[model samples]
Target: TKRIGVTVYDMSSFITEGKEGMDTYAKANNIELVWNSANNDVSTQASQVDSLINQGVDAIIVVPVQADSLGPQVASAKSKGIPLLAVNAALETPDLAGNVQPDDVAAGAQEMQMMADRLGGKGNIVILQGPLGGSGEINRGKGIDQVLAKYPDIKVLAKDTANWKRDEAVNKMKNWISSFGPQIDGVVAQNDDMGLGALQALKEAGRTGVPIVGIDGIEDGLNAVKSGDFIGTSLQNGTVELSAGLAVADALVKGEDVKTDPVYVMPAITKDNVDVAIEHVVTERQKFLDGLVELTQQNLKTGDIAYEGIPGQTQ
Candidate 1:
C-alpha cells in the first residue's frame, strides 16, 4: 500500500472537505493516509513538510499557508523523491506535481460585479479579504479591484483581512458599521463564511439595506441567500478539487504516467442561480461528501437531491 500525506494550513469546514476527500481517495486506492495540520502557521506547515519528507511518504499534498514561506519545504519534498501536489492554496516553489484550485479572481470579480449591479453601480462597500499573501486573498482581491475599476462610483469604504474566519469578519464588520454607519453601502466578503458573518454583524447593527456578496457557495451560505441575506456569491466546490487531486496523487503513486493537467475550477453560486450549486454538490461530490461524513449514504439515497432545479438547466 502507498502512503499519502496531507499538510493543510488550518482546520475549517473547507479544509475538512479536502482532508476527508483525500482519505476517501486513499481508501479507494488502498493507500494509507497521514495528515499534518499547521493551524494556519506557515512556519509550522513548512516544518510539517519536512517531517512528511523524513517519513518518506510516496506522495504529499500540501495546502500552503503562504506562497513564499512554504517554498523551501516544497523544494525539500521534491529533493527527497516525493511527488508533491499543491492541493489548493499557495506554495513558493514550482516543484509541485500540479495545483487544484478554483478561479478565485474570476469568482471575486463576478461577486463584485453582482454587488455593483445590485447597488446600481453607486455605493460604498467593505471587503473582508483573506490573508495577505495567500492566493485566495490575492486573486479574489484582484477580481474585486478589476470590477470596481469599471464602476467608478461604487467605492470601497473599507478593506481588511479577516484571515479567513467567520467571527473575525463579523467583529470587523461590527466595528466598521459602528464607525462608518450608513456610509457603508454594501459588503464584499471574500468567502461565504466571512460574508455570512458580516451579514450577522449588519443584522445586529440593524443595517439591512446594503447588498452583500461572497464566494464558497456553501450550504449555509446558499440558505442565507435564499433567506434574502446576500445579494449573491460564487460557489467554491471544495469536494471537486479534493477528489480530483486525490485521484491524481493515486495515479502517480501507482507508477502510472499522468497527463500535465493540473487545475480544476469550481462552479460559481448565486441566488438567482443557486439550484445549479445544489446540483453540482449532488452530482459531483455526493460520494466524497458521503465518505467525509458530511452527508450519509442514506441522505442522498433517501433525501431529495434538490428541492428545485435552476431554470434553463437540466439534470
Candidate 2:
C-alpha cells in the first residue's frame, strides 16, 4: 500500500468535507493516508510539508495556504522526486504532478456578472475577499476586476480581505455599513462563510434589499438562497476536486503516465434552481468516487473532465 500525506489549509466546512472524500477513496484503495491541518498558517504548512518529506511518504497532496508562499516546499518536493499534487488551490511552481481546483476566474466572473445584471448594471457594492495572497482570492479578484471594468457605472465603495472568516467578514461588513450607509447596494464575498457573515451584519443593522452573493454552494449558503436571504452562490465541489487529486496521486504511485487538467468549472446556484443545485451536489459526489475507483483500478489515462455550469433562471 502507498502512503500519502495530505496537507489542508484549515478546518473550514468545505475543507473538512473534502477530507472525508479523500479518506473514503484512500480507505477503499488501501492507501495509507496521513493528514495534517495547517490552521491557515503558511509557515506551519510549510513546516508540515518538510515533515512529510522527511517521513519519506510515497506522495504529498497539498492545499496551499497561499499561492506563492510555498516555493521552498515545492522545491523540496521536486528535489525529493515526491509526486506533489495541489488540491483546491493553485501553486505557481512548474512541473507539478497534478493540480485539482475550481476555475476560480470563471467562478468570480459568473457570480459578479450575474450580480451586475441583477443590479441593472449600476450600483454601489462592497467586496469581501478571501485571504489576500491565496490563489482563490487572487484569481477571483481578477475575475471580479474583469467584470467590473466593463460596468463602469457600478461603483465599488469599499473592498478588503476578510481572510475567509465569518466573524472577520461580520466586522468588515459592520464597518462598511457605518461608512457607506444606504449607498451600498450589494455585497460580493469570495466564499459562503464571508458572504453569510456579511448577510448577518446587514440583517442586524436592519438593512434590506441589499442583495448579497458569494461562491461555494455550502449548506448555509444554499439555505440562504432558498429563503431569499442571499441572492445566489456558485457551487465549488470540494468532494470532486479532492477525489480527483487523490486519484492523480495514486496513478503517480503506480508509476503511470497521468496527464489531466486540474481545473473544474463550478455551477451557479440561485433560488430558482436550488433543487437543481441540491441534485447536482448529491449526484456529483457519488460520480466522483466511482470515477476515482475506475481510474485507479484500470490505470486509466483519462481525458480532461469538464463541468459546464448550470444556467441561471429568473428568481
Candidate 3:
C-alpha cells in the first residue's frame, strides 16, 4: 500500500472536479490519499506541502495557489527522493519529472477572443480576474492582454481582481453596473464563476444580451452558453488532470517508465458545441472516472486518462 499526499489551492467548483477525480482514482486503485486544502492561501499550502514531504508520503501532488512560490517545496520533495507532481498551475520549482496542467494564457485568450468576436471587435467591456499573483490569473490575463492589443477597438472600461469568488464578482459587477451602466457592452471573466456572477448582476439590472465569455467549461458555464447567456468558455477539464497527476505520481513511486509530459489541449467551447461539452463533462467525464483506476493498476499510469487544457499557458 502506497501513501500519496495532495495539496490543493482550494476546492472551488472547478478545482472540486479535479479533487473528485483524484478521489475516485484513489478508491479504485486502493491507494491511501492524504488531503489538504489551502483555502487559496499560499503559505498554508506550503505548510501542508512541507509537512507532507516530512511525513515521507510515497508521492505528492500540488495544485498551486500561486505559481512563483512553490519551487522550494517541489525541490524539497525531489531532494527527499519523493515524486512531486503539479497540476492546474505549474510550480516555481518544477518536479522536472512530470506535469499535468492547462495553459492559462490560451484559456484566457480564447474566452476573450470569443467575447470580442461576439461584439464584433468594438465594445466596452470589464474584466473580472482571479488573485493577482496566481499562475492562472497571471498567465490568463497575459493572454487576454495580448488579444486586446490586436483589437484596439475592444476597450476595457474597468479591470479588477475578483479573487475567483462568485459573491465578490457579483458585488464587483454591481458596482460596475452602477458606474458604467449602458456603456458596458461585454464582460470578460477569467473563469466561469466570475462570468456567471457578471451575468447574474446584468440580468438583475435589466442589462441583458450583453456578450460575456469565461474560461473553465463548468456545468453552469456550459448551460449559460447553451442558453445564450454566455458567448462561450475555454474548457479546462479538472477531473482528468488530477487523475493523471495521481497516476503519474503512483508510477513514480513504483519506479516505472511513464509519460512525463501530458500536453492538454485547450478548446474553445461555444453555443454550437455547448451540448457536446456538457455531454462530455457529464457522461464522458465519468467514463474516465474508471480510466484512472485502469491507468494506476498498470503501474502508476498517468497517461492512460484522456485530458484537455487551456492553450498557450506559460511555463
Question: Which candidate wins on lDDT?
Answer: 2
Q: For model 2, how does the per-residue alpha-carbon lDDT over 65-181 read when each residue is reduced to its tens digit?
A: 898878888788989999888888888888577787788999999889878978999999999998889999999999999999999899999999998889999999999999888
For model 2, the local distance difference test gives 0.81
Among residues 3 or more apart in sequence or in different chains, the pairs in candidate 2 whose N, CA or C atoms overlap within 3 Å are: none
Pairs that collide in candidate 3 are 71-93, 103-313, 106-311, 251-300, 266-309
TM-score of each: 0.87, 0.90, 0.90
Query: Which digits, one per residue and each the tens of the lDDT, describe model 3 over residues 63-159?
Result: 8888788778878888989888887777667454678767778777888888878888898999999888888888889999989998989899999
Ranking of all predicted structures according to TM-score, beginning with the best and ending with the worst: 2, 3, 1
Candidate 2 least-lDDT 10 residues: 299-308
Query: After superposition, which runs of candidate 3 have C-alpha atoms over 4 Å from their true positions?
Result: 94-96, 283-288, 291-315
Residue range 61-172, candidate 1, lDDT tens digits: 8877877777777778778778888866756577877665666788788888888889998988899998889988988888888998899888888899988889999899
Residue pairs with backbone atoms closer than 3 Å in model 1 (clashes): 235-269
How does candidate 1 fare on TM-score? 0.87
State how far residue 151 of model 3 sits from its true place (Å).
0.8
Instruction: Report the poorest 10 consecutive residues by lDDT, candidate 3.
Output: 306-315
